[PDB]
Amino acid sequence: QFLQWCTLQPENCAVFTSDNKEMFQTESGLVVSTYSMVANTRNRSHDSQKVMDFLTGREWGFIILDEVHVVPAAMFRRVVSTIAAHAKLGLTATLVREDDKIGDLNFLIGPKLYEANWMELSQKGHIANVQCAEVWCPMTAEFYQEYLRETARKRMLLYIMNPTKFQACQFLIQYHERRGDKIIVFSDNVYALQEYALKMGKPFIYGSTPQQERMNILQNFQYNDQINTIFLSKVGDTSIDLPEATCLIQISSHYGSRRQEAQRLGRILRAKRRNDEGFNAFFYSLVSKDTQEMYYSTKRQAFLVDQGYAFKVITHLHGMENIPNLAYASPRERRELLQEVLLKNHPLIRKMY
Amino acid sequence: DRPIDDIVKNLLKFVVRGFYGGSFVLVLDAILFHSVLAEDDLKQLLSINKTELGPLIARLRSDRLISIHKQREYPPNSKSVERVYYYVKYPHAIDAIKWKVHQVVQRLKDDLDKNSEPNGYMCPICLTKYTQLEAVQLLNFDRTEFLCSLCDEPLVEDDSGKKNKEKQDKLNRLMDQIQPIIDSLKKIDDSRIEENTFEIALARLIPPQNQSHAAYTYNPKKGSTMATLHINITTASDEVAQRELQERQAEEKRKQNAVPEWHKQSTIGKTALGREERENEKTLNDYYAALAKKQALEDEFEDV
Amino acid sequence: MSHSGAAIFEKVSGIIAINEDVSPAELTWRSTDGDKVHTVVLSTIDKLQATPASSEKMMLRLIGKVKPQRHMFSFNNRTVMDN
Amino acid sequence: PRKLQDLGLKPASVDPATIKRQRKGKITNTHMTGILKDYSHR
Numbered sequence A: 001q002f003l004q005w006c007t008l009q010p011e012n013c014a015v016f017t018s019d020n021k022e023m024f025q026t027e028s029g030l031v032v033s034t035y036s037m038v039a040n041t042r043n044r045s046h047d048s049q050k051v052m053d054f055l056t057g058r059e060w061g062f063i064i065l066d067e068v069h070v071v072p073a074a075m076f077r078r079v080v081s082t083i084a085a086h087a088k089l090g091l092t093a094t095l096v097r098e099d100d101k102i103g104d105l106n107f108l109i110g111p112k113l114y115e116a117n118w119m120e121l122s123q124k125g126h127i128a129n130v131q132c133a134e135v136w137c138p139m140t141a142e143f144y145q146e147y148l149r150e151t152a153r154k155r156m157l158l159y160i161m162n163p164t165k166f167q168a169c170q171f172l173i174q175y176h177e178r179r180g181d182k183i184i185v186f187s188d189n190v191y192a193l194q195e196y197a198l199k200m201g202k203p204f205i206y207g208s209t210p211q212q213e214r215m216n217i218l219q220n221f222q223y224n225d226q227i228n229t230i231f232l233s234k235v236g237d238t239s240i241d242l243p244e245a246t247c248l249i250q251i252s253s254h255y256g257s258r259r260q261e262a263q264r265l266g267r268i269l270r271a272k273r274r275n276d277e278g279f280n281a282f283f284y285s286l287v288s289k290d291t292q293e294m295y296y297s298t299k300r301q302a303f304l305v306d307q308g309y310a311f312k313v314i315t316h317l318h319g320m321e322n323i324p325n326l327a328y329a330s331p332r333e334r335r336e337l338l339q340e341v342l343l344k345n346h347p348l349i350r351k352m353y
Numbered sequence B: 001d002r003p004i005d006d007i008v009k010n011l012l013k014f015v016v017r018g019f020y021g022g023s024f025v026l027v028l029d030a031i032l033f034h035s036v037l038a039e040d041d042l043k044q045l046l047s048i049n050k051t052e053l054g055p056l057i058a059r060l061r062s063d064r065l066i067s068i069h070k071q072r073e074y075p076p077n078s079k080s081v082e083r084v085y086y087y088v089k090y091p092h093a094i095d096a097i098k099w100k101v102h103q104v105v106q107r108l109k110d111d112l113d114k115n116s117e118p119n120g121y122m123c124p125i126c127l128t129k130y131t132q133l134e135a136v137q138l139l140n141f142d143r144t145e146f147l148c149s150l151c152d153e154p155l156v157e158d159d160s161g162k163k164n165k166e167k168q169d170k171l172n173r174l175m176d177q178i179q180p181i182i183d184s185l186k187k188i189d190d191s192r193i194e195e196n197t198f199e200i201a202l203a204r205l206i207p208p209q210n211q212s213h214a215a216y217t218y219n220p221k222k223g224s225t226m227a228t229l230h231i232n233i234t235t236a237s238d239e240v241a242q243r244e245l246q247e248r249q250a251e252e253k254r255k256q257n258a259v260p261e262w263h264k265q266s267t268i269g270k271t272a273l274g275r276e277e278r279e280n281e282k283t284l285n286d287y288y289a290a291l292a293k294k295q296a297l298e299d300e301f302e303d304v
Numbered sequence C: 001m002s003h004s005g006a007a008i009f010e011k012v013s014g015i016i017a018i019n020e021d022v023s024p025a026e027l028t029w030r031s032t033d034g035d036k037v038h039t040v041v042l043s044t045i046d047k048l049q050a051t052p053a054s055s056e057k058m059m060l061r062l063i064g065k066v067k068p069q070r071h072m073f074s075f076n077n078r079t080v081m082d083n
Numbered sequence D: 001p002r003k004l005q006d007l008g009l010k011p012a013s014v015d016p017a018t019i020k021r022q023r024k025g026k027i028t029n030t031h032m033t034g035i036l037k038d039y040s041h042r
């Protein structure tokens, strides 16, 4: 973006990453790096030590702290002290944390300069006009019976994998695929992500998937018309490149993370179809009824309703019974799924060695 | 074809007709007619022998009128040989012709300048020339005759200057004969010559014989470092149907952006989700008739 | 110039010419020694087969209509094939 | 072609080619082997 949007020559720019560690030789210029690279208290390499000495010994005129919500962390806090910068700008979309350290940014960076009105930007077509919703999935009798007499960690996976949520997600995928929408399905539980993807026959992307496979699946999602739904874990929440999507389903979530909830919404906020009249993107938060998932979903949606979004509940989907194939419609299939979820949890001496 | 190509063809034709024999003329005209030839090509067209074309190929290679290509191919009988392809490089050939004629006229001018020098002398016994400068150092005590250094013979006069007018007239008779060549170079110097090569010469190729072992298809190598238009004719009757089909496409576009039923209205009150004209025309035609009476092996495949 | 070029037909060298002025157009092929003359009726041609420029063997195939009629044209220069 | 200019005569020949010239990784989405398509270009 620096090389594209402005008249900055590439010899004035430099990158401080694992692969790239050479610096610009001019008297001034740009360096771009990672928070973990600058704030690495571990034994860094010699070349990285030299580059960090160059960064610390140079008086910088401007620092840009992209995704400034992670600055109040333990030693991510120290990047504003290890770097002597005159001007500090923090750029973010999710200025919330689940602890009280979000208020420490005025001591770290400075006062909140500008709050963007999200609805003013949506009504002017700058961002997509999403239709936020919250589908209530009634938990089945046997799953809820197992849900009450369990610990919280097992309760988590047990309310994520309820078969009514399977049916609701399958119906929503089918309906929005008939509408020709690019759908990104989010679920932080890796096992649930894999199970939903295998049940619905859609590709899934998470942490241990190879990067070339991730790129191939992203290209297929962006271009192949038969690939309109990709399942994503918490990899999609953080700042990675994604194709434009117009529908979103949140199967599971990481507690009441408002930052993650607003980060997931941002992946459908920049769709190309904003210029089309009457276009709306769709946000769905599939949550299981009468569980702690209501509590965590409300805690997550607190930030979005603070922005002004209206989360309309959906306790009924028209056409659930009329869909051809229902995931775990039969009681025996649901019982098998219940059992599966429960069972989830001297050079010559060197020839010796 | 190209008029400049006609000019270079006429220039090579004139130089081979003037400064070369008939066999050279046949070879160069074969190349100028059939653009690229091999040995068997020229042999079949001219009924010439391999040693007979020897001096011809050697002279037109040394004088750069014909270039050679050392491509070997793979015929289906697998009895391949490293055949040679004879063709012409037009700019190199015309530069060689220009250099040759310029050196010819410069050498003739220098010979004319040497003939402008006085006659000098030459001793017939020893057959050695003696310039006028060295004659004075070899004159007799009588100051009457120039005597040889070795033969001691009275020097006789050479003919350096008597033939000077003859050499000038030879230059004049060369100049009007070479005048079409310089006219062709005048027209070429006012134009742009495309630097042809082996690939370029194959574009205007005409094959000479059917069973030619020389496959003119070129084989590039690695390591050597030396659209369609379609129309919709309508009689303005089906175009209304086309507009209706575009309206149907617009309706499909409206259905694509339709709001879902669980978004436009509340779902709380609903249940929870879970598991005869023809004879008329005949009568009018009969009435019109009554009125008228009243007035009365497989390979790669491509979709092209 | 674009309508004429050297070609090989049935392992026999020749010249491909386009008779565009006559209706219907004809792709006549003349042997260099005058042994035979081959012509193609362009009305009864279904589809044209070609080889990519990366392929070493340079071949062009014609497919007729009704056992379909098949013709094979081998060329020597790629620009002649393009035209 | 480079000595005609030394003598004043314009050459039609440019100087020749003698003077101055020049993995497969593992798959995790095994349930759609062949459904996904390769995209080496945009």
Ligand SMILES: [Zn+2]
Binding pocket: B123, B124, B125, B126, B127, B128, B148, B149, B150, B151, B152, B153
């Ligand atoms: Zn003598």
Ligand SMILES: [Zn+2]
Binding pocket: none
């Ligand atoms: Zn060199």
